[PDB]
Every structure is written in structure tokens, then in C-alpha cells.
Enzyme design. Structure first.
Site, PDB file in Angstrom:
ATOM      1  CG  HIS A  25      46.440  39.423  43.356  1.00 62.98           C
ATOM      2  ND1 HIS A  25      47.783  39.230  43.194  1.00 62.98           N
ATOM      3  CD2 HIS A  25      45.835  38.372  42.766  1.00 62.98           C
ATOM      4  CE1 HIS A  25      47.975  38.107  42.529  1.00 62.98           C
ATOM      5  NE2 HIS A  25      46.782  37.598  42.243  1.00 62.98           N
ATOM      6  CG  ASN A  73      42.865  32.496  37.077  1.00 61.62           C
ATOM      7  OD1 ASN A  73      41.970  33.118  36.500  1.00 61.62           O
ATOM      8  ND2 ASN A  73      42.685  31.361  37.734  1.00 61.62           N
ATOM      9  CG  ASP A  98      50.064  41.584  43.176  1.00 59.41           C
ATOM     10  OD1 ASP A  98      49.584  41.687  42.006  1.00 59.41           O
ATOM     11  OD2 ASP A  98      49.876  40.567  43.891  1.00 59.41           O
ATOM     12  CG  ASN A 119      46.967  34.466  40.049  1.00 66.04           C
ATOM     13  OD1 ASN A 119      47.312  35.629  40.317  1.00 66.04           O
ATOM     14  ND2 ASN A 119      45.762  34.027  40.385  1.00 66.04           N
TER      15      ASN A 119
HETATM   16 CL   LIG Z   1      43.461  36.038  41.934  1.00 69.22          CL
END
Ligand SMILES: [Cl-]
Ligand SMILES: [Cl-]
Ligand SMILES: [Cl-]
Length: 196
Positions: A25, A73, A98, A119
Site C-alpha cells: 500500500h 484513508n 498501488d 481507500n
Molecule cells: Cl490503509
């Protein structure tokens, strides 16, 4: 402010902290940190914009770099005020992230479109709209909805990491096209990448 589709803000999405730095991520962070080193752009603490940011010359163009330090997020809580303050239109923004929907070693330049379940992008598109450019760094399929968290917060096995690193290296070579506003040629040259 920004000028047309010459990219002048390059964002890398990720989570802060040593425990997240090697996770899938953080692929966007990897790209932007490598780009910053390539061009000698200092990434320094930017508490006013909840991030680490830099400014410098890429191929004759004044470009800003941003790593939100919000957690993924909440990435829009850095990106949105940063882009507003500097009067950077979405069309001059590249966001590296990503991409669950692509294989490790696949990389694509996309203009527009949705968050695709990401997110970080989900925190940005509502505010600035969709019409920014994305560097979609393939991280591979998670194998089920339940294993998505474990996949993106995973550290990739070395084979997959090598494939991603080669794709990111290719994209670094094409940023010169992006800061020059040659988005179509950059899309052709990035999207054509193959690892082997
Ligand atoms: Cl996250
Ligand atoms: Cl795409
Ligand atoms: Cl995207």
C-alpha cells in the site's frame, strides 16, 4: 498555479511509519521517494499540509512532491489543501498508488476515472474530482475481499517486489514526458512496459 497538463504536483500515497514502509500500500511512496532522489528534490516535513513535501526542478519544470502523513484513508486531508493553496488544478496532478487490479510488474498511466476501491483515492476524488492523472502500480490480486487488508498491508515476496521495482524504475524514466505535458506519449510508453 499549474499550467495546463504539465504535471506540477506528484503525490505518492501510503501510510507513515517504519511498520508500513515496505508494504504494498506504500507503492506510491516508493515511486515518489525514488523520483525525489533522482532529481535532487528534498522531501521535508510539511506540518501545515499534514505531509512530507518538496519542490524542485524536473527537466526545466517547477514541480512539487507530496507524501501525505495522514494515514492512507485520510490522504485528502493533505492533498486537497496543498493543491488549493498552490492553485494546482487536478489536470496538473499525478497521484502514484498501488493498484490491486493489476499484476506486479504492470504499471499504467490513467487519466480520470474512479477510486477502484482504493481507500486513499476515495479520500481525494470527492474534493478535487476525478480528472487527475494516476500512476497505477500493480501490486497483484488479493485472492478474496476478506484478504484485501492483509494483501495491501503485506510486504511482497522478493519476486513480486522485483517486478514492482522494475516497473517503478521504468515510470521514473518517463516523468520527463509528464512534466512537459506529453501525457499521451507518456501513457503509451508507460503502459507498454513488460518486466521480461
Ligand atoms: Cl490503509
Ligand atoms: Cl489504466
Ligand atoms: Cl487510478
Amino acid at each position: 498555479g499549474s499550467h495546463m497538463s504539465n504535471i506540477s504536483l506528484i503525490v505518492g500515497l501510503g501510510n507513515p511509519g517504519s511498520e508500513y514502509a515496505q508494504t504494498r500500500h506504500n507503492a506510491g511512496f516508493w515511486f515518489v521517494e525514488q523520483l525525489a532522489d533522482k532529481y535532487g528534490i528534498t522531501l521535508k516535513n510539511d506540518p501545515k499540509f499534514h505531509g512530507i513535501s518538496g519542490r524542485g526542478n524536473i527537466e526545466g519544470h517547477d514541480v512539487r512532491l507530496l507524501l501525505p502523513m495522514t494515514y492512507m484513508n485520510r490522504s485528502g486531508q493533505s492533498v486537497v489543501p496543498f493543491s488549493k493553496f498552490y492553485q494546482i488544478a487536478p489536470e496538473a496532478i499525478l497521484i502514484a498508488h498501488d493498484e490491486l487490479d493489476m499484476n506486479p510488474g504492470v504499471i499504467r498511466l490513467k487519466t480520470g476515472g474512479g477510486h477502484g476501491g482504493h481507500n486513499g483515492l476515495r479520500d481525494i476524488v470527492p474534493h478535487i474530482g476525478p480528472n487527475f492523472h494516476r500512476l497505477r502500480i500493480g501490486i497483484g490480486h488479493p485472492g478474496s475481499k476478506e484478504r484485501v487488508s492483509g494483501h495491501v498491508l503485506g510486504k511482497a515476496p522478493s519476486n513480486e517486489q522485483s517486478l514492482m521495482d522494475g516497473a517503478i524504475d521504468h515510470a521514473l524514466s518517463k516523468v520527463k514526458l509528464l512534466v512537459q505535458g506529453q501525457v499521451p506519449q507518456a501513457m503509451n510508453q508507460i503502459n507498454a512496459y513488460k518486466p521480461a
